[PDB]
Structure formats: C-alpha cells, structure tokens
Amino acid sequence: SNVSVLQQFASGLKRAKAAKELQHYVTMELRSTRFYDQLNHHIFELERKGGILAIASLIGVEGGNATRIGRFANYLRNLLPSNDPVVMEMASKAIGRLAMAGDTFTAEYVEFEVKRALEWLEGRRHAAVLVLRELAISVPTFFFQQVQPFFDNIFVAVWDPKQAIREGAVAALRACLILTTQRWYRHTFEEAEKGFDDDRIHGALLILNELVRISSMEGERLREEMEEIMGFGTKPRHITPFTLVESRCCRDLMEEKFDQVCQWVLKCSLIQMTILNLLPRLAAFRPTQYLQDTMNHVLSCVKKEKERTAAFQALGLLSVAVRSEFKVYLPRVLDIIRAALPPKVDATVFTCISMLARIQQDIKELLEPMLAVGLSPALTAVLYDLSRQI
Incomplete structure (x- = not known):
C-alpha cells in the first residue's frame, strides 16, 4: 500500500495497536517484497513493539524464506543485546515463532542462539533464559544437543542474586528435566544440595520439587486441571464433505523442604509463594512430621493476605493427598472459609471447596x-462438577 502502509505503520507504532497488527496479519494472509522489507526497516528503526509485531506476523504468515530470514536475523541480533522490559519478552516470542517456522536456516539460528546463551551463562541473562525456554518447548531435538554445558553453566548462573533469572531458568530446568525423564540427575541433586547448604532457598525447593513432581504426576494433574478451569455410534453422512533417581532422592527432597518451609516462614512473599506452591506436591508424593511442617506454613499463610489464593490451592491439594489425618484441621479450614466469604479471590476458594469434595451432609x-456470595463462572463450574462427582 506504500503510503497507506507507512501511515498505518506509523499509527500502530504511535488494544488499537493489537487490532492494527491483527489487521496487518490478515492482510498478509491474502498477500512488493522490497517495499515490505523497507516498511519493516522503518518500523524497526523507529515503537519497538510495533516493529517486532510486524516482523513476527509477516514471517509467520507469509512463510519463512531465505531472503527474509537473512534480512531479519540481523534485526533480531540487534534487538537482543540491548532492549527494554516487555519488549524483550515480545522479541523472545518472535524468536520462538521463527524457530517453529520449519526452515533450513532454523537449525543454524537455533544453534547460534543456544551458543550465545551458553556464553552468557540485566537484559542479556534474561534474554538468553527466555530464548532457552522457548527453544526447549519448541525444539527438544536441537535443545538436547547441548546438555552438559547447559547444566554446568545454569547451575552457576541460577544462584546469582536475581529474581527474573530464577523465575525463567527454573522453567527452563523444568523443560529440560521433563525431556530427560521422557528419554545428570546426580549432578542436579548435588548442585541443589550444595546451594541449599534467603536467596538459596526457593531455588533448591523448586529443583527438588522438579524430581518429586516428575516422578509423581498425580499431584501436578490436579493443579493443571484447576489452572485450566458426539458419539461413536453416530451414522456418518452418506455424502462425505470435502476435507528410580527421582524416587530415591524424593525422600531427601521432602526432607530438605520440610525444614526450609519451617525456617523461611517469613524471611525475605516470593519465598512464601514458592513454598506454598511446592509443599502440596511433596506431601502428595509422601504425606506426620512432614505433614505438620507443611500444615504450619499453609495454615499460617491462609489467614494472611496476598497469599490466600495459592494457599487455598495448596490446602486443597493437601486435602486430596491426605484423607484421614487432614480431618483434624477441617474445623479451622471451614472457619477460615466462613470468615473469608462474607466480605464478598473467592473464586479459587470455591474451586478449593470443589477439590475438598473431590462430601458430608454439612455441605x-x-x-x-x-450461593449468597453471588454469580461467577468458577462457582457454576464448581457446582456442576460437585453434582457430577457426588
């Protein structure tokens, strides 16, 4: 569109931007190449969110080509070293979209990014971590090419005094460990124990919970389902229309967690959040001293604010895991719920009531x-599932 294209580009660069990007993608679906490259260069030079949007959408829709990959690789390699927050995450999304395009240059680009990430292992460390996470999720085959340098560099870079590095690298470790189990463990456990022996608390807890959760998917399945929350006999139309190490170390994992949860009860919100997330899975793997240590922190956090959601989720997982011994604290849990409801966050409380059902006539x-609280999709779904199960 030349002039109109440049105008729309400037408008998008200066909700509305998202709509403009969607319209541009829809137009690219139907649809010169030099003009498109020049427009991309103008938006890139000018703001950065619009440029990354245009680059990623055009690549994904129009399809990866040798010239496009060669021209846009320089733009990506210029964006990566220095940029601003949020824009970096969008750039990493664009890198992932280019990675899953399925072209010959994809292997070279992925290896280049992985090697530079390893060299790095703060707009650089977080960028490398995000790229590693996306490549692990998208391309396990080329992500498994470098595993020993992966573990060796990450086990040193993680324990640095940073938060975003921890949040991302733990997820990257999640993906790597999932792939490894589907297809190291001793080194991971040794490094986690060395780090554990307030920054060096939640990281070790997460690493141990990785082994525990991967070994036992039953605890994770409930959390995943709650986070998300025809017939075979039909006659087809007569006219067809056109168409081991994680089990033997899980004890030590629970052991080094029952003490950390009791120690860092209120040390440096983030630590409490991670402990609340990780305790129920460990108890689900192996439920009284562990049970008491988990109960203290969970019950303490439930009463407090800013953690009620995750605390109730952990409470529901604990109720599912422990059936008889958990009945002692039922009056406390019910009283806290009866205190929290009248103020009306409570949607997750309804979900945890459903999981507790997942019974007595007191219900x-x-x-x-x-019912008096009000209407909410969580409440309706909880009631429907309750009527289903019981």
Missing part, C-alpha cells in the same frame, strides 16, 4: 453462603 448447610 447442605454450607450451601447457603456460597
């Missing part, structure tokens, strides 16, 4: 306040 008396 008939408990029906009235939940």
Whole structure:
C-alpha cells in the first residue's frame, strides 16, 4: 500500500495497536517484497513493539524464506543485546515463532542462539533464559544437543542474586528435566544440595520439587486441571464433505523442604509463594512430621493476605493427598472459609471447596453462603462438577 502502509505503520507504532497488527496479519494472509522489507526497516528503526509485531506476523504468515530470514536475523541480533522490559519478552516470542517456522536456516539460528546463551551463562541473562525456554518447548531435538554445558553453566548462573533469572531458568530446568525423564540427575541433586547448604532457598525447593513432581504426576494433574478451569455410534453422512533417581532422592527432597518451609516462614512473599506452591506436591508424593511442617506454613499463610489464593490451592491439594489425618484441621479450614466469604479471590476458594469434595451432609448447610456470595463462572463450574462427582 506504500503510503497507506507507512501511515498505518506509523499509527500502530504511535488494544488499537493489537487490532492494527491483527489487521496487518490478515492482510498478509491474502498477500512488493522490497517495499515490505523497507516498511519493516522503518518500523524497526523507529515503537519497538510495533516493529517486532510486524516482523513476527509477516514471517509467520507469509512463510519463512531465505531472503527474509537473512534480512531479519540481523534485526533480531540487534534487538537482543540491548532492549527494554516487555519488549524483550515480545522479541523472545518472535524468536520462538521463527524457530517453529520449519526452515533450513532454523537449525543454524537455533544453534547460534543456544551458543550465545551458553556464553552468557540485566537484559542479556534474561534474554538468553527466555530464548532457552522457548527453544526447549519448541525444539527438544536441537535443545538436547547441548546438555552438559547447559547444566554446568545454569547451575552457576541460577544462584546469582536475581529474581527474573530464577523465575525463567527454573522453567527452563523444568523443560529440560521433563525431556530427560521422557528419554545428570546426580549432578542436579548435588548442585541443589550444595546451594541449599534467603536467596538459596526457593531455588533448591523448586529443583527438588522438579524430581518429586516428575516422578509423581498425580499431584501436578490436579493443579493443571484447576489452572485450566458426539458419539461413536453416530451414522456418518452418506455424502462425505470435502476435507528410580527421582524416587530415591524424593525422600531427601521432602526432607530438605520440610525444614526450609519451617525456617523461611517469613524471611525475605516470593519465598512464601514458592513454598506454598511446592509443599502440596511433596506431601502428595509422601504425606506426620512432614505433614505438620507443611500444615504450619499453609495454615499460617491462609489467614494472611496476598497469599490466600495459592494457599487455598495448596490446602486443597493437601486435602486430596491426605484423607484421614487432614480431618483434624477441617474445623479451622471451614472457619477460615466462613470468615473469608462474607466480605464478598473467592473464586479459587470455591474451586478449593470443589477439590475438598473431590462430601458430608454439612455441605447442605454450607450451601447457603456460597450461593449468597453471588454469580461467577468458577462457582457454576464448581457446582456442576460437585453434582457430577457426588
């Protein structure tokens, strides 16, 4: 569109931007090459979010080509070393979209990014971590090419005093460990124990919970389903239309967690959040001293604010995991819920009530306040699942 194209580009660069990007992608679906490259260069030079949007959308829609990959690789390699937050995450998304394009240059580009990430292992460390996460999720085959340098550099870079590095690198370790288990463990456990022996608390807890959770998917399945929250006999139309190491170390994992949860009860919110997330899975793997250590932190956090959601989620997982011994704290849990509801966050409280059902006739008396709270999709789905199961 030349002039109109440049105008729309400037407008998008200066909700509305998202709509403009979507329209541009839809137009690229139907649809010169030099003009498109020049427009991309103008938006790139000018703001950065619009440039990355245009580059990624045009690449993904129009399809990867040798000239396009060669011209846009320089733009990406210029964006990566220095940029601003949020824009970096968008750039990493664009890198992932280019990675999953499925071209001959994809292997070279992925190896180049992985090697530079390893060399790096703060707009650089976080960028490398995000790229590693995306490549692990998208291309396990080329992500498994470098595993020993992966572990060796990450086990040193993670324990640096940073938060975003921890958040991303733990997820990268999640993907790597999942791939390894589907297809190292001793080195991971040794490094985690050395680090554990307030920054060096939640990282070790996460690393141990990785082995515990991968060994036992039952605890993770409930969390995944709650986070998300025809017939064979039909006659087809007569006219067809056109168409081991994680089990033997899990004990030590739970052991080094029952003490950390008791120690860092209120040290340096983030640590409490991670502990609340990780305790129920460990108890689900192996439930009284561990149970008491988990109960203290969970019950303490439930009463407090800014952690009620995750604390109740952990409480529900604990109720599912421990059936008989958990009944002692039922009056405390019910009283806290009956205190929290009248103020109306409570959607997750309803979900945890559903998981607790996942029973007694007292639920008939408990029906009235939940209904009196009000309408919510979580409440409706919880009631429907309750009627299904019981």
